[PDB]
Amino acid sequence: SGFRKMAFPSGKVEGCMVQVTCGTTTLNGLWLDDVVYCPRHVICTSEDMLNPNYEDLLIRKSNHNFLVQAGNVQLRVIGHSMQNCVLKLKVDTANPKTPKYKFVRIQPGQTFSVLACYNGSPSGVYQCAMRPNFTIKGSFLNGSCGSVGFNIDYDCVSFCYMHHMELPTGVHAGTDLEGNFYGPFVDRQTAQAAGTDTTITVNVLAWLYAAVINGDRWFLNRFTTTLNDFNLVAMKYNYEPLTQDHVDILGPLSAQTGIAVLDMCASLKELLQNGMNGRTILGSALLEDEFTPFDVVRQCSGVT
Amino acid sequence: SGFRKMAFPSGKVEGCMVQVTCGTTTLNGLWLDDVVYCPRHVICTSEDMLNPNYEDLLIRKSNHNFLVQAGNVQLRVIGHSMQNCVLKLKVDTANPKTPKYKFVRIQPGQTFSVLACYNGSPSGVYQCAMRPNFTIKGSFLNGSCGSVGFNIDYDCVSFCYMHHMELPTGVHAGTDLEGNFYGPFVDRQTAQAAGTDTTITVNVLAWLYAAVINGDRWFLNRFTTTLNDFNLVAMKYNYEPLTQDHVDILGPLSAQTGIAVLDMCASLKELLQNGMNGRTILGSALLEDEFTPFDVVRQCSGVT
Numbered sequence: 319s320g321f322r323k324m325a326f327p328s329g330k331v332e333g334c335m336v337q338v339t340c341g342t343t344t345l346n347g348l349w350l351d352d353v354v355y356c357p358r359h360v361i362c363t364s365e366d367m368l369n370p371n372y373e374d375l376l377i378r379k380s381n382h383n384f385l386v387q388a389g390n391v392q393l394r395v396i397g398h399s400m401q402n403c404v405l406k407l408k409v410d411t412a413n414p415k416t417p418k419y420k421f422v423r424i425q426p427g428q429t430f431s432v433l434a435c436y437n438g439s440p441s442g443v444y445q446c447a448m449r450p451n452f453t454i455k456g457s458f459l460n461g462s463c464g465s466v467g468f469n470i471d472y473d474c475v476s477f478c479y480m481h482h483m484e485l486p487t488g489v490h491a492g493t494d495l496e497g498n499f500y501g502p503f504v505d506r507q508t509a510q511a512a513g514t515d516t517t518i519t520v521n522v523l524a525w526l527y528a529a530v531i532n533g534d535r536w537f538l539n540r541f542t543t544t545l546n547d548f549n550l551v552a553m554k555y556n557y558e559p560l561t562q563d564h565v566d567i568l569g570p571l572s573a574q575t576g577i578a579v580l581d582m583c584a585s586l587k588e589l590l591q592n593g594m595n596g597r598t599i600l601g602s603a604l605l606e607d608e609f610t611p612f613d614v615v616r617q618c619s620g621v622t
Numbered sequence: 623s624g625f626r627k628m629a630f631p632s633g634k635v636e637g638c639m640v641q642v643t644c645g646t647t648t649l650n651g652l653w654l655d656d657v658v659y660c661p662r663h664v665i666c667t668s669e670d671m672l673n674p675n676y677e678d679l680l681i682r683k684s685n686h687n688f689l690v691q692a693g694n695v696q697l698r699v700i701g702h703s704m705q706n707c708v709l710k711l712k713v714d715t716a717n718p719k720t721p722k723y724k725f726v727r728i729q730p731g732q733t734f735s736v737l738a739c740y741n742g743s744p745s746g747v748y749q750c751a752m753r754p755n756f757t758i759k760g761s762f763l764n765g766s767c768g769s770v771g772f773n774i775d776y777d778c779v780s781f782c783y784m785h786h787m788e789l790p791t792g793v794h795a796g797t798d799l800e801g802n803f804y805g806p807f808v809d810r811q812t813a814q815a816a817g818t819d820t821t822i823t824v825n826v827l828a829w830l831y832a833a834v835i836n837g838d839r840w841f842l843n844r845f846t847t848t849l850n851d852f853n854l855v856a857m858k859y860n861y862e863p864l865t866q867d868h869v870d871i872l873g874p875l876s877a878q879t880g881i882a883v884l885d886m887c888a889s890l891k892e893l894l895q896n897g898m899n900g901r902t903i904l905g906s907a908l909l910e911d912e913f914t915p916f917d918v919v920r921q922c923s924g925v926t
């Protein structure tokens with residue numbers, strides 16, 4: 319028992335982190351097979367970042383301008399290309415530590431682990447969620463760009479995020495591994511505002527089920543509700559609307575605890591209306607939304 | 623910017639996890655050099671756990687009774703010994719993935735990462751703190767015993783904890799890598815109560831400095847206090863007493879922010895007396911105590 323914000327073991331991703339330098343800019347790259355993926359803004363100077371024309375900037379760059387270092391050894395660059403907001407640097411050596419992998423574009427509400435890196439070296443691992451406004455609330459300093467978000471299913475790593483920037487509000491924006499930004503963000507040093515950061519309702523419900531499984535049951539009430547009644551309350555508290563797709567995904571948790579999804583929705587409704595009254599749930603004084611129903615099942619079952 | 627509960631990259635420890643089976647009991651082992659370390663209760667049956675005599679139980683066990691598997695391959699056991707509450711199984715092969723390592727017995731208040739494992743396979747990584755009552759609030763299911771807690775300084779892994787049991791209250795107890803339990807706990811299926819779980823004051827202060835660095839400054843007040851005045855308040859709220867040793871360790875954080883340690887203590891005092899008033903600090907509605915002053919500096923500086 320016990321419930322923690324748990325990240326995937328990061329070893330398989332640590333073996334893929336490299337340092338990429340172009341000119342005076344150094345960031346992180348992801349080395350999978352004979353390709354190194356990194357943010358295309360590695361070709362920019364601070365001057366270029368204000369209004370970059372990446373195609374024009376890339377013309378002045380040759381393979382030898384991209385310095386790729388894995389550990390203390392230099393990789394030879396034999397090709398380069400821009401795919402959306404990422405650069406793909408073809409190297410002459412396949413990464414011997416390449417795990418089984420996939421590139422996935424996640425939906426908002428989905429969680430993943432981030433291996434924060436600096437100079438191609440890992441510094442820490444933490445669990446994130448892609449917010450409904452397509453930002454992530456990470457912990458990234460200068461030099462962290464190119465750090466990646468991922469999920470692991472047994473031996474396969476699904477890379478879902480690559481860090482590119484910090485908005486002026488301190489929240490983070492990035493792309494999938496095909497270089498497409500999550501959200502409307504662009505890789506430019508221009509003020510870009512994030513939309514409403516709503517709460518991931520299905521995740522809060524999953525975490526309430528996790529709390530029941532672990533013994534924290536004080537919040538359970540004698541009430542039920544309907545999807546339409548619950549959503550009227552959810553809209554008011556800037557919670558994402560709950561759909562029957564979300565109810566379906568909470569089914570195994572509902573079955574394990576014997577608490578119907580709509581009864582858990584009614585407990586959530588009263589928690590929103592009355593607050594916690596100075597109480598905690600799983601050692602938290604607020605409703606946690608960065609655990610999916612899959613995360614709860616995984617942690618409560620011990621999937622390795 | 624941004625502040626997260628961050629764990630160390632777990633790769634160096636993942637390469638050390640093995641599965642140990644003795645009879646019908648399977649748990650995790652830590653393979654460093656030619657020795658596999660695991661909880662001695664691997665020799666117990668559920669019947670034995672009630673009142674085990676480990677010396678007597680160990681007499682009926684030979685090297686061939688300890689099955690050690692690393693990945694899909696079996697390690698040959700050429701010696702065994704009990705050191706306090708851990709068994710050391712000498713194998714004929716040195717672990718090729720043995721990182722540079724040390725065994726450290728941590729003090730309460732110190733944080734570490736746990737690589738939760740099942741059947742010698744890693745399932746997740748999270749950040750913990752050794753509570754002042756010598757328990758940890760982990761996430762451990764049956765089969766997780768033998769999972770270890772650690773810290774990493776550049777390339778050296780300092781193993782500080784090995785998981786042994788869950789108290790009837792759902793909190794966790796274990797040993798250092800020499801087999802000595804943290805706290806008064808014994809490896810026996812008997813009700814053992816934990817003492818008062820006080821708050822790690824120096825850690826809360828460190829996290830308040832982290833909050834100031836990251837822009838959350840609403841809690842800062844126009845007040846100061848003394849160590850004796852603060853401790854009168856800390857004693858009342860079951861917070862650990864703050865010493866000049868703790869003030870000394872907060873010095874770099876005090877210097878970076880320009881906020882004297884005693885002024886931060888006065889902000890903490892008002893937070894304890896008035897509560898958060900429905901507000902948050904670093905996305906938390908309670909005062910976080912599982913970040914040491916070293917963790918805050920490390921994360922706010924990007925140590926890899």
Ligand SMILES: *CC(=O)N1C[C@@H]2C[C@H]1CN2Cc1cccc(Cl)c1
Nearest residue numbers: 345460461462463482483505506507
């Ligand atoms: C995170 C990282 O490594 N970098 C590279 C430079 C400094 C920091 C951010 N990068 C500049 C930048 C500004 C605005 C937008 C984007 Cl995409 C990048």
Ligand SMILES: *CC(=O)N1C[C@@H]2C[C@H]1CN2Cc1cccc(Cl)c1
Nearest residue numbers: 649764765766767786787809810811
């Ligand atoms: C965590 C783990 O792998 N185990 C082994 C068995 C089941 C679970 C706990 N172990 C029994 C036990 C009961 C009381 C105290 C201790 Cl030290 C162990």
